[PDB]
Amino acid sequence: VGAXAXVXWXWXWXWX
């Protein structure tokens, strides 16, 4: 339960 809403931003990297 660290904090924020997920670990990072979005899901993946850049855009596939």
Place this chain on the structure above:
Amino acid sequence: VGAXAXVXWXWXWXWX
């Protein structure tokens, strides 16, 4: 301050 560690799984989408 939701929860976790950031806001998603990485940053962006897929992989670039």
